[PDB]
Design an enzyme around this catalytic site. Sequence first.
Site, mmCIF file in Angstrom:
data_model
loop_
_atom_site.group_PDB
_atom_site.id
_atom_site.type_symbol
_atom_site.label_atom_id
_atom_site.label_comp_id
_atom_site.label_asym_id
_atom_site.label_seq_id
_atom_site.Cartn_x
_atom_site.Cartn_y
_atom_site.Cartn_z
ATOM 1 N N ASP B 58 12.600 3.286 -44.817
ATOM 2 C CA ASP B 58 11.689 2.298 -44.259
ATOM 3 C C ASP B 58 10.816 2.967 -43.208
ATOM 4 O O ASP B 58 11.319 3.709 -42.362
ATOM 5 C CB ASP B 58 12.475 1.142 -43.640
ATOM 6 N N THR B 91 4.540 -0.781 -43.631
ATOM 7 C CA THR B 91 4.510 0.118 -42.482
ATOM 8 C C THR B 91 4.224 1.564 -42.880
ATOM 9 O O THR B 91 3.369 2.220 -42.276
ATOM 10 C CB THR B 91 5.829 0.020 -41.726
ATOM 11 N N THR B 92 4.940 2.085 -43.879
ATOM 12 C CA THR B 92 4.665 3.438 -44.354
ATOM 13 C C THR B 92 3.223 3.571 -44.818
ATOM 14 O O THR B 92 2.522 4.511 -44.432
ATOM 15 C CB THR B 92 5.617 3.813 -45.486
ATOM 16 N N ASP B 392 13.103 -6.801 -46.036
ATOM 17 C CA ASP B 392 11.852 -6.530 -46.745
ATOM 18 C C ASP B 392 11.664 -7.474 -47.926
ATOM 19 O O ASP B 392 10.584 -8.039 -48.113
ATOM 20 C CB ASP B 392 11.804 -5.072 -47.208
HETATM 21 N N1 LIG Z 1 7.718 0.786 -59.847
HETATM 22 C C1 LIG Z 1 6.627 1.214 -59.173
HETATM 23 N N2 LIG Z 1 5.720 2.023 -59.751
HETATM 24 C C2 LIG Z 1 4.635 2.452 -59.087
HETATM 25 N N3 LIG Z 1 4.355 2.127 -57.817
HETATM 26 C C3 LIG Z 1 5.182 1.324 -57.117
HETATM 27 C C4 LIG Z 1 6.388 0.812 -57.771
HETATM 28 N N4 LIG Z 1 7.022 0.052 -56.865
HETATM 29 C C5 LIG Z 1 6.280 0.073 -55.731
HETATM 30 N N5 LIG Z 1 5.183 0.826 -55.887
HETATM 31 C C6 LIG Z 1 4.164 1.081 -54.851
HETATM 32 O O1 LIG Z 1 4.695 1.966 -53.872
HETATM 33 C C7 LIG Z 1 4.063 1.688 -52.624
HETATM 34 C C8 LIG Z 1 4.997 1.883 -51.437
HETATM 35 O O2 LIG Z 1 6.132 1.035 -51.562
HETATM 36 P P1 LIG Z 1 6.964 0.703 -50.233
HETATM 37 O O3 LIG Z 1 7.478 2.008 -49.689
HETATM 38 O O4 LIG Z 1 7.867 -0.481 -50.474
HETATM 39 O O5 LIG Z 1 5.771 0.219 -49.293
HETATM 40 P P2 LIG Z 1 5.766 0.712 -47.780
HETATM 41 O O6 LIG Z 1 5.188 2.080 -47.959
HETATM 42 O O7 LIG Z 1 4.833 -0.237 -47.088
HETATM 43 O O8 LIG Z 1 7.203 0.636 -47.333
HETATM 44 C C9 LIG Z 1 3.499 0.281 -52.694
HETATM 45 O O9 LIG Z 1 2.086 0.318 -52.504
HETATM 46 C C10 LIG Z 1 3.831 -0.188 -54.093
HETATM 47 O O10 LIG Z 1 2.693 -0.828 -54.666
HETATM 48 MG MG LIG Z 2 7.991 -2.219 -49.070
#
Ligand SMILES: Nc1ncnc2c1ncn2[C@@H]1O[C@H](COP(=O)(O)OP(=O)(O)O)[C@@H](O)[C@H]1O
Ligand SMILES: [Mg+2]
Lengths: 527, 525, 538, 190
Positions: B58, B91-92, B392
């Site tokens: 996270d 956030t990331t 989340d």
């Molecule tokens: N199965 C998947 N295939 C491709 N991209 C994905 C998949 N699941 C999530 N993503 C993309 O990965 C990105 C980062 O996910 P996540 O780490 O949950 O967001 P954050 O970076 O805000 O924590 C998001 O923009 C999401 O659209």
């Molecule tokens: Mg997320």
Amino acid sequence: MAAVKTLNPKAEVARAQAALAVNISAARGLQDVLRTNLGPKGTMKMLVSGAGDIKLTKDGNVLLHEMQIQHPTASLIAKVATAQDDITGDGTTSNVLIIGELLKQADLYISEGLHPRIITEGFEAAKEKALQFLEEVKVSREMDRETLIDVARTSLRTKVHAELADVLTEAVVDSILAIKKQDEPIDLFMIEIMEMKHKSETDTSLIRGLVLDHGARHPDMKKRVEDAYILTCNVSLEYEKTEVNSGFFYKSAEEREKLVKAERKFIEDRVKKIIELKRKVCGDSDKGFVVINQKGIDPFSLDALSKEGIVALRRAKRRNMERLTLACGGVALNSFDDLSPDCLGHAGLVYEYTLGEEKFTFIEKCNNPRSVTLLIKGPNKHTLTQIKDAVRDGLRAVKNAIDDGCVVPGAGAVEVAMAEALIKHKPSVKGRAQLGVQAFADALLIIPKVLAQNSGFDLQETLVKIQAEHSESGQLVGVDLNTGEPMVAAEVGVWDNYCVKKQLLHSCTVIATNILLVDEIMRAGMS
Amino acid sequence: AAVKTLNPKAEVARAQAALAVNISAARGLQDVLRTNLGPKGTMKMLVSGAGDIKLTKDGNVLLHEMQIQHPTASLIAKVATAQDDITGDGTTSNVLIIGELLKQADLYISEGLHPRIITEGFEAAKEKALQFLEEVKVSREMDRETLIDVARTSLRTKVHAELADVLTEAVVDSILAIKKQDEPIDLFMIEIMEMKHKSETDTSLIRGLVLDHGARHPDMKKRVEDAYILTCNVSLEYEKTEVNSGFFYKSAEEREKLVKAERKFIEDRVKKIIELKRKVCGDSDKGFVVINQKGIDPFSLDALSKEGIVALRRAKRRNMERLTLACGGVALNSFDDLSPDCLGHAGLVYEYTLGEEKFTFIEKCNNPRSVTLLIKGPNKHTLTQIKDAVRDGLRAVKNAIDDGCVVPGAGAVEVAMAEALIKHKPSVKGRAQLGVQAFADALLIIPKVLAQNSGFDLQETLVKIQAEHSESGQLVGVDLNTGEPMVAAEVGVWDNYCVKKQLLHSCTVIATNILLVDEIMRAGM
Amino acid sequence: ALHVPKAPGFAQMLKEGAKHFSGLEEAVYRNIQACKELAQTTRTAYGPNGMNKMVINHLEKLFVTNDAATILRELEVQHPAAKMIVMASHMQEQEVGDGTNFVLVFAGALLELAEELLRIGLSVSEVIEGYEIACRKAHEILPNLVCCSAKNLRDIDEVSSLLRTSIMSKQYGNEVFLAKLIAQACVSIFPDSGHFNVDNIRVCKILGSGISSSSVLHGMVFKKETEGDVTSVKDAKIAVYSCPFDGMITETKGTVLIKTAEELMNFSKGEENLMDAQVKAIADTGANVVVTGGKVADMALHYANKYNIMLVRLNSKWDLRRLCKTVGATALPRLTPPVLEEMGHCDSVYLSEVGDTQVVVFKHEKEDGAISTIVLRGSTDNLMDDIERAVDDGVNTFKVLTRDKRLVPGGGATEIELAKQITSYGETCPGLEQYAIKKFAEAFEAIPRALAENSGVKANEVISKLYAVHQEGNKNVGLDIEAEVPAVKDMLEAGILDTYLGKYWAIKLATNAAVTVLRVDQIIMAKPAGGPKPPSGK
Amino acid sequence: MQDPNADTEWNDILRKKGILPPVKTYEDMTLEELEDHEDEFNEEDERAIEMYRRRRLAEWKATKLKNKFGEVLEISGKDYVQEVTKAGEGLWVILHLYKQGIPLCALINQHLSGLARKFPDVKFIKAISTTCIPNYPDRNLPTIFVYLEGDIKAQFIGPLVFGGMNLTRDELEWKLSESGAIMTDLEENP
Ligand SMILES: Nc1ncnc2c1ncn2[C@@H]1O[C@H](COP(=O)(O)OP(=O)(O)O)[C@@H](O)[C@H]1O
Ligand SMILES: [Mg+2]
Ligand SMILES: Nc1ncnc2c1ncn2[C@@H]1O[C@H](COP(=O)(O)OP(=O)(O)O)[C@@H](O)[C@H]1O
Ligand SMILES: Nc1ncnc2c1ncn2[C@@H]1O[C@H](COP(=O)(O)OP(=O)(O)O)[C@@H](O)[C@H]1O
Ligand SMILES: [Mg+2]
Ligand SMILES: [Mg+2]
């Protein structure tokens, strides 16, 4: 924290991305310092040693060695610049700038996950094409005084003020055009460089003769000689003791007196030979006789020579032997065994100049001297040092323009044109090394960019104007530092050395390639 | 400098140096957080100064746990903390887009361009990107399948795939239960209890409540089948008088009478409870459970056990509402006039001992508007990780319900917004077009890093994807198993419209404010 | 050019004493190396031939044991990955009670083989895929390897034969005696209901008479003395009070307000007359033994002596609760005489001197009750603590058998059969998963390897023999401890068996621990705290 | 302290509160060394090298002037006062009181004969102790007196303190340089 730190715990290590970051950051730092040195609109930096000594400089090599830096990448780049300076005399600031900009333009694509090996392949391809374009655009010109004057101007105007540059131009060009023999490499050692610290800096002149930094040590010796026979010798005229530890043994004060008179017979004889040559060659007091000894002359010999009207200077420089025999025209001797009037040179004037506590000896009105001197006059030690650096740059510039009879347009013109040619060449490169080519081109483009930045103009607008003018017309154009507009460098007299440009391309490409391929910086020789 | 002549012990970074500082710090954060992005990202382990272990992917947790002392990093950490407080996710990506905006702005500022023009381009690009976002957003009736796909897109990034497939059903069912038609979802009505005994895939949704304590009288039942729940906030232990009364007696008999009398006040409330119990369940068929926010002394515990009542004491102030919404009674601060209508019903109540602690399950409620997620796992860090993941996921489903729109994922919206910005650039007057280009190349960091994390070439994948989106127009993103373009809406990769909008707004704002910083100064001593 | 500077970014912004490790080299391999060091630290204690270790903790307390979880607790493990493997081992101890050393050995082996696979060119993701699929196959396989079942837990010979294995690894020399004791204790407990509580088995450690003097007691023992003059009772009618044995006083504040010489003259006599009435009501209910969880008053003790009541004082509340369960009584918060239901009964309550120690014994004659005690005699406190750990292992095995009555062959037989079957499964699976499946299979070999190494024989000869015999078809064959040379024998016919649940949970937890350790790629350690430790754990 | 001082933040906070206290150059090269290279030196350096060479030549000529005797000589008691008490101003004097009988004295005299040529600046004298001092004890030799400006600077007296019969021409040289008379370039090896 890694492999090396498990064996040598006090080890410092930068791996892959960290090493690249370290090196590129240092390169970008050097570039940020040196960006202001480029061009005549650049600014002079003042450098104060740990002792308090002042240096006023715009020279990339001087600034590098004088900045207070402890970085390994900076050491690499300083050595590359030092080689540039040792071989060409100019091109150090541009060297540093192109290195830094190659590294930056390569980081642009390596941050995007591209491998540095592919960027280095693109660098090698672009080097080939750029060297070709350089040999193609080089202007092979018969080196006339006007061309050499423009070249030396392009260098001295970068290194010093405009009036002083307009003086040093004539001085340097005349100096080289005088010590030069048809189709025979120029020995710059035959241009002595003497600095005097009394008058204005615009009094810097070219003496078509020699200036020794010493004079006669006997007061009764003349201070001015009009028609002078110069005897350049390397023969001791002072008392020399025996190698084999001889010592004197006497039984009476009279015998002691005889031995005192005898112990000098060896040197009295050489003084007598000089005096006999003097009498045989100038039987009257009309002409003069000047002895210049690379070795010593004791007070007795000085008295003996003054009595006969000879001006004797002692302990001259080992280079002055050759400089005097090439300027005046005699023969330098290590013995007076069989000396003849043919061993003498002629100087239409010899005189002495006292400056505070020091004395100088001028030897002028030589016939056709293949050796001359540049008298660097100025009010301050740092002014003199600055002018010395400038005249070094200018002498190297004229020498290189003569040696390589070709000459390249300046003001970033060759760089703009080489960038356009590389960008037109890119499709012929197979794979993603096209990005290395693009990086090479945008790196070459840092010279016009920085010139604009220093003249006080917008880099992007000026560069698009210049590239547009070069693509629509094809005229090799560069920056006009007073209007920011494109100008034809060959028409306005802004010339660079083909040798310097080639050395830039080669050395910068090589060092940048080797840096990009560094994947580990490591200090583990401790304990 | 100016400040150092007045405060000699002052630290100052001016103009270009200040920019150099800020952008460098941003890029440092990006380098750390680049690997967090996506399901193929890597989990980082974080060890406190005490030795406690955190396994996390996270961005917000990673920031607050990294060991950093940089002012720009503080600014960006606070921006991410706000992102997390309001949306729960993003956030990331927030940090990545901030870092990439700063980098792409350095691209043009190193060329002598003024940061003001880049910030103007940032503002124009923000406007156009928000417009394109509202246009491409998918307004969808939030069905269990849509919400399941959303929660999958979040939990698959935060945890392992099988555990994500479990937490998906858990979270979606949890929200779809505490949800009232057209009435904002109060996530407080989802208790989150963690148990540390079984496997992590045993994490479940109890359609009821789980209190982290049980009865303290041993003779009290450990299982109750048809239970009347009395949710009260009334002290059943000895309360001394406010006015320092003090007892005065002249005989041991009087001392005994005063000892028997001093408890009459609480004996009366216990008697009220016992009479309610007898009147509502005259036999031993049903059960009666008192859950008190306040204390219950041993005498009251004995008095209630003797009558067959299960009394838990010092429950949580939120469990009052959770029990009145799950069971269905009324929470009381006094037993003055209590009636059987003040009681709730639970079709089962029992106790579970785990090592030295006790838990109380209240299940088989009729239609509980409050439920609990029982986070089971073998390790404290597994429990913490699953808690973060379910936070989340709950925020994701809540946002998809609140904002009935939903945005395609896998960097698809970012790719399309980059193309739209590049087509919009000429309409911008002056050199702020370059800032627009930077914005586009900043938006493009989401697919790039996804490729970077799936083990693919950023440049090749991104050109493939942009080509596919220009030839078709289909909102396409990265397939993390083939590196090819894929239609995110068709494969069930969904993102939150609120999250993307918050990203655009907050990232643009903080990046603008950083780019306009020209002096960092510590002179407070 | 004599110093490498920290690279711009995270390397510079990192705090002073913080550490950052990233990648297979700085993180994964270092974690695997730490876990390997842990497994090596505890390997030599595995099995009946396992040797004891003398761990001295930061408080200079001595633990002499070959109980893996005890050694791990008393070691100051500071590497986080090793901390995670220890967390898994402690979860095994909590869930099952035995098998912590299996968890350590198996996790360390899986991680070593995962390092091997990463070196040959597999990715952590593929290693994890193969490890998880192979764990699923192991769980699919294990139910089929079950050979025996308990079939009766109310017996004492069958239960002793069943607990012998768990209490053999610990206390190898004397395993029939201890298994008899623990079977006696366990079957006195374990009512007609299927629930069995391990806290109802109490262990009293008294010093000085060798372990063969240990005994079982259907009742309770308290290293206490009696407060009064009575020391023995043959038909105990125990009355239990959570309140002191004194006159009840006010919770607010009490002041004796005298205003006349008569009240002053009569107050003390009234107090004693009240106490006499209270204790006489208690005695007249028939109670001959009173046990108070609080203090005893001098006057109340006087009158308890007068009416021939044995007084016992239990400072602890858990001791009082367990005594109530033992005797069938109810702790009364008032000094009121007990009703016929609130009273407890014992065939005997007496004060004795076991060794140097004086004890109060509540002893039933019936071969049952709610609580049973094991009185451990021994010449050393450390020896008795080790035997108590063995008792805990046996009791937790009895509970596991109450939960799941299935048994698998021990002595490495189950492990060898698992290795064989999972290798045969991996040979069929194509793709990059087969390497990890076969390594997960070979990891099981670590168990008979450790048994052989500790018995004092060549592990390779033993493992080759076991593989050969299990190829011929014998799944119940394991290694023989009773052989100076490498040998093997039928674990079933010998009676060396483990619990299906024990192996199930050990494999599950070890696999999860290894897979968790592998999923780590970056580690960001903070500077070590001087903080007054975790607040919640006290 | 209560806890072991290590890399922890607690000790650091305690420290912040106030608890738990927390060939170089031609300048040195001799006449021989200067000849050794000659070419190496850059001409710009060679300009100041001329001055440093003149300085070293002047110093060497001064030492030549100072090396008056360079050989061991014997003085009788009668002229002792002139030769030792009233030697050259600032001239280091080393007097060996000895009898020809004692062999250790002869060894010391041979070593002094070597050192005299090795150190032509220092004055080396030898004298019969019975003829320098009225009734000098027999068992009190060899006696090495080190004098400066008529004042005794050192006195190595005895057939045992001097350094045994194994005394080579090295350890005696160091013992004489102890008072700073002969100024050798080594350390006490044996
Ligand atoms: N199965 C998947 N295939 C491709 N991209 C994905 C998949 N699941 C999530 N993503 C993309 O990965 C990105 C980062 O996910 P996540 O780490 O949950 O967001 P954050 O970076 O805000 O924590 C998001 O923009 C999401 O659209
Ligand atoms: Mg997320
Ligand atoms: N009058 C001028 N107008 C425009 N450009 C010039 C002028 N004089 C010199 N230049 C260019 O400026 C560049 C840098 O000059 P200088 O600083 O002397 O070189 P270096 O960077 O090697 O020290 C050269 O490439 C030269 O062609
Ligand atoms: N008599 C025996 N012969 C061979 N192996 C045995 C015997 N008794 C116990 N074992 C084996 O010892 C291992 C358990 O020993 P122990 O050190 O207690 O480890 P754990 O703590 O994992 O139970 C099991 O593999 C079990 O099969
Ligand atoms: Mg130049
Ligand atoms: Mg065991």
